[PDB]
Amino acid sequence: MRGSTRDQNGTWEMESNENFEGYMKALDIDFATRKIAVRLTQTKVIDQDGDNFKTKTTSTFRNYDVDFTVGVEFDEYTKSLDNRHVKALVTWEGDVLVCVQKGEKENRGWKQWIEGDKLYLELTCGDQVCRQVFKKKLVPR
Numbered sequence: 001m002r003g004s005t006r007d008q009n010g011t012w013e014m015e016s017n018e019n020f021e022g023y024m025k026a027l028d029i030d031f032a033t034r035k036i037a038v039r040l041t042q043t044k045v046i047d048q049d050g051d052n053f054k055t056k057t058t059s060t061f062r063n064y065d066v067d068f069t070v071g072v073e074f075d076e077y078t079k080s081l082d083n084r085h086v087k088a089l090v091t092w093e094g095d096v097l098v099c100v101q102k103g104e105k106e107n108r109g110w111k112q113w114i115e116g117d118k119l120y121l122e123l124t125c126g127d128q129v130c131r132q133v134f135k136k137k138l139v140p141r
Contacts (some may be wrong), residue, residue: 003095003113014135
């Protein structure tokens with residue numbers, strides 16, 4: 001994948017989500033939670049000021065909010081998911097925003113990037129990959 005810009009500011013609405021179930025299962029998220037969440041549309045709001053990100057990902061079930069500074073390791077406590085601690089680090093690879101979440105689970109993290117007018121997010125855990133695509137609702141520019 002390739003990002004067309006590093007500017008991810010805006011509000012984005014999920015248009016597709018594939019293998020979210022597998023990703024959730026890899027995280028040991030319980031059956032009932034997976035069934036509720038799997039096909040609920042998510043909205044993602046990104047407020048990005050240089051290296052500082054505040055993100056909110058919302059549905060009518062749960063929200064999944066995380067704030068970070070690019071290039072600064074942090075203790076991510078995953079209360080909205082599996083209630084674990086990971087050492088999270090978000091870096092740029094080109095114009096792809098890459099997060100590695102070090103901890104118990106292998107190969108855990110995500111990659112987020114813009115292609116033109118859409119936002120893409122690939123979430124990984126173990127041997128599972130979830131691919132999400134979001135259409136634009138609002139961007140500043």
